[PDB]
Amino acid sequence: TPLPAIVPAARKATAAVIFLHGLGDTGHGWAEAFAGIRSSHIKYICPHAPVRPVTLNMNVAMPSWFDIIGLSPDSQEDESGIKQAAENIKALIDQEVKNGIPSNRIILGGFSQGGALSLYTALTTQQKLAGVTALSCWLPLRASFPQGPIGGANRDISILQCHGDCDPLVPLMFGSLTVEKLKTLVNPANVTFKTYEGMMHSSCQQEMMDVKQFIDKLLPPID
Numbered sequence: 001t002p003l004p005a006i007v008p009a010a011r012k013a014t015a016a017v018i019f020l021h022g023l024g025d026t027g028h029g030w031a032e033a034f035a036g037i038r039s040s041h042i043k044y045i046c047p048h049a050p051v052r053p054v055t056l057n058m059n060v061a062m063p064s065w066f067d068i069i070g071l072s073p074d075s076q077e078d079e080s081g082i083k084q085a086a087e088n089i090k091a092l093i094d095q096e097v098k099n100g101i102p103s104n105r106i107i108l109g110g111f112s113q114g115g116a117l118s119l120y121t122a123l124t125t126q127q128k129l130a131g132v133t134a135l136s137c138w139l140p141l142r143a144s145f146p147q148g149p150i151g152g153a154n155r156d157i158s159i160l161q162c163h164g165d166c167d168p169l170v171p172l173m174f175g176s177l178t179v180e181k182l183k184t185l186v187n188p189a190n191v192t193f194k195t196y197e198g199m200m201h202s203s204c205q206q207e208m209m210d211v212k213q214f215i216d217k218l219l220p221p222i223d
């Protein structure tokens, strides 16, 4: 475990954002993107997934939270991997609670596979979270979720899901079908879908402005 890239709070941290990068990345690029929208009282934590073989691309070894097999809803998914990665995320949250920031003052998010992991984590933890930012991603192991609202700790969590309309790796329709399913799993009044014209498998400045607004609305100052 190389230590996560962190954007510290100015001097007094009362909330945290845990953000998981996408395939092949480290946590550093996203931590700098978050510094550009940082709020004084918010700690930003971007852990790094470990290098591992990735079945999708000739087994090439690169950072990935879990193995990626295919690009299709009919593709087999790395169930043991996703769940183990999910357990590791909850341990990272629990450690922040011990550090001093309650779980309901923490937003979990990610990009692509990291956003997939963040959604799955948020929907399976009894750790009540402040919200989720899911960027260009999808809901993994979707068939494992029974009908109806999950109930559970995060039945009311607020979710911001973002997706470029020219993404060639996670087609926009995957994000769209994901948000609509999320709206049957948690309270639909707290789920926001935003799309970005021209954007591919990347980020853009308007999207980062919507994430900042989302984070600041749900994690407002307490001083």
Ligand SMILES: CCCCCCCCCCCCCC[C@@H](Br)C(=O)O
Pocket: 022, 023, 068, 070, 071, 072, 073, 111, 112, 113, 114, 138, 139, 142, 169, 170, 174, 177, 178, 181
């Ligand atoms: C309700 C949900 C319906 C659609 C679910 C289908 C999921 C298919 C996703 C394929 C993976 C895309 C790979 C992205 C890589 Br570049 C990464 O980050 O690992």
